[PDB]
Scaffold this active site. Structure first.
Site, mmCIF file in Angstrom:
data_model
loop_
_atom_site.group_PDB
_atom_site.id
_atom_site.type_symbol
_atom_site.label_atom_id
_atom_site.label_comp_id
_atom_site.label_asym_id
_atom_site.label_seq_id
_atom_site.Cartn_x
_atom_site.Cartn_y
_atom_site.Cartn_z
ATOM 1 C CG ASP A 53 36.887 51.448 51.660
ATOM 2 O OD1 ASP A 53 37.525 51.774 52.684
ATOM 3 O OD2 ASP A 53 36.666 50.255 51.366
ATOM 4 C CB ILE A 88 43.538 36.910 40.065
ATOM 5 C CG1 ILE A 88 44.003 36.813 38.618
ATOM 6 C CG2 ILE A 88 44.087 38.191 40.676
ATOM 7 C CD1 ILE A 88 43.634 38.027 37.809
ATOM 8 N N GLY A 89 42.747 35.813 42.916
ATOM 9 C CA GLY A 89 42.563 36.025 44.334
ATOM 10 C C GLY A 89 41.112 36.213 44.711
ATOM 11 C CD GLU A 90 37.743 33.944 47.337
ATOM 12 O OE1 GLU A 90 36.947 34.530 48.101
ATOM 13 O OE2 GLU A 90 37.485 32.847 46.801
ATOM 14 N N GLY A 91 38.731 39.321 46.226
ATOM 15 C CA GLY A 91 38.425 40.631 46.777
ATOM 16 C C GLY A 91 37.174 40.474 47.620
ATOM 17 C CE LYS A 141 37.321 42.766 40.359
ATOM 18 N NZ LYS A 141 37.375 44.197 40.801
ATOM 19 C CE1 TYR A 184 32.431 44.134 45.092
ATOM 20 C CE2 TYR A 184 30.465 43.689 46.384
ATOM 21 C CZ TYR A 184 31.345 44.590 45.798
ATOM 22 O OH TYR A 184 31.161 45.952 45.900
ATOM 23 C CG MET A 242 37.625 32.987 42.280
ATOM 24 S SD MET A 242 37.789 31.200 42.351
ATOM 25 C CE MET A 242 38.085 30.982 44.083
HETATM 26 N N1 LIG Z 1 45.100 41.994 38.574
HETATM 27 C C1 LIG Z 1 43.872 42.448 38.796
HETATM 28 N N2 LIG Z 1 43.214 43.080 37.817
HETATM 29 C C2 LIG Z 1 41.974 43.539 38.013
HETATM 30 N N3 LIG Z 1 41.114 44.184 37.234
HETATM 31 C C3 LIG Z 1 40.000 44.422 37.946
HETATM 32 N N4 LIG Z 1 40.155 43.914 39.169
HETATM 33 C C4 LIG Z 1 41.365 43.367 39.241
HETATM 34 C C5 LIG Z 1 42.063 42.712 40.242
HETATM 35 S S1 LIG Z 1 41.350 42.463 41.815
HETATM 36 N N5 LIG Z 1 43.305 42.267 39.997
#
Ligand SMILES: Nc1nc2[nH]cnc2c(=S)[nH]1
EC number: 2.7.11.24
Length: 330
Positions: free
Chosen positions: A134, A21-24, A44, A26, A28
């Site tokens: 934040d 889905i991506g990288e926040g 996560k 922390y 992947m």
């Molecule tokens: N699509 C999506 N759903 C989530 N639920 C908890 N974090 C997320 C993230 S970062 N993206």
């Protein structure tokens, strides 16, 4: 172990078919199928950085609220010796408000609904005497029916107004309250309200209202629109170095909101004005924002819960604390 983009995502039997889905922060983020209740989720991977991990886990496990992201499951090794990665499982959302503002015009009805839900979540958080610190569009998740949940408590703290003062030139830049660059550590509730004011402005125009390039650029952007602070507001700032900096600046006149957002609802502009007030003592609080005529159609105190109770170590005790706090999901 299933592998995702050259990486171990050892999330066991229960969670299958992982999609990146991506990288926040922390690391992947993947989505995954939960075979215990047949719905896809977000997972996560987590590999200081330990501090904010612990902080978030501790908070999100204590909080329960429709507008705050929860924690459904936590996956780790059965023993501390074997524990390396920690996997956090959460509800799968469709998008975040940042991605939404890039691509979509929002109706007044959507802006109003989003703002209500942010404030409703914030009301709960503040009743527990916690600061988020934040708030920004990427920390606001939305599902397909526009339900909103606040995420990322990595920077959160317990409120502490007695110890807020600090020197001149001491979270994400654009959503920082002005007092942070001047005399505040950001330990009072008013700094979250400022961030919501910024988010509201961003929802009205699809652009960040104060996109500072850097510390003092941020300040001169704010003053470029709010105008020079009054003598009364200045008197509140007693640190000579903050005060004399402000007095050294050229006079700037307030730009009226209806000129910046000529087709905004006038009630929304009146609430925006009270959130983006230079003096934190004059800045509206969350319960007052909820009671504002702009949100009348949603305002319902009996459906706006508060928390039942409000809320330095070697790296060894921290690994251990994370282990103990995550035991319940074993
Ligand atoms: N699509 C999506 N759903 C989530 N639920 C908890 N974090 C997320 C993230 S970062 N993206």
């Amino acid at each position: 172990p299933e592998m995702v983009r050259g990486q171990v995502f050892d999330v066991g039997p229960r969670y299958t078919n992982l999609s990146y889905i991506g990288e926040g922060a922390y690391g992947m983020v993947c989505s995954a199928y939960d075979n215990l209740n047949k719905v896809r989720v977000a997972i996560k991977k987590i590999s200081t950085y330990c501090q904010r991990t612990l902080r978030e886990i501790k908070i999100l496990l204590r909080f329960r609220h429709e507008n705050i992201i929860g924690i459904n499951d936590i996956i780790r090794a059965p023993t501390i010796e074997q524990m390396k990665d920690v996997y956090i499982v959460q509800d799968l959302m469709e998008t975040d408000l940042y991605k939404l503002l890039k691509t979509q015009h929002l109706s007044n009805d959507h802006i109003c609904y989003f703002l209500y839900q942010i404030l409703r979540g914030l009301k709960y958080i503040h009743s527990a005497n916690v600061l988020h610190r934040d708030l920004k569009p990427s920390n606001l998740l939305l599902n397909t029916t526009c339900d909103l949940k606040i995420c990322d408590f990595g920077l959160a703290r317990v409120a502490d107004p007695d110890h807020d003062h600090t020197g001149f030139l001491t979270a994400t830049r654009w959503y920082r309250a002005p007092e942070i660059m001047l005399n505040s550590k950001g330990y009072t509730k008013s700094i979250d309200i400022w961030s919501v004011g910024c988010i509201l402005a961003e929802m009205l125009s699809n652009r960040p209202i104060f996109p500072g390039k850097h510390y003092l650029d941020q300040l001169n952007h704010i003053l470029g629109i709010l105008g020079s602070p009054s003598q009364e507001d200045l008197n509140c700032i007693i640190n000579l170095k903050a005060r004399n900096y402000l007095l050294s600046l050229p006079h700037k006149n307030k730009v009226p909101w209806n000129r910046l957002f000529p087709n905004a609802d006038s009630k929304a502009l009146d609430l925006l004005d009270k959130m983006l007030t230079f003096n934190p003592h004059k800045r509206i609080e969350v319960e007052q924002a909820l009671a504002h005529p702009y949100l009348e159609q949603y305002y319902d105190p009996s459906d706006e819960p508060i928390a039942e109770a409000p809320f330095d170590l070697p790296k060894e005790k921290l690994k251990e604390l994370i282990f103990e706090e995550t035991a319940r999901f074993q």
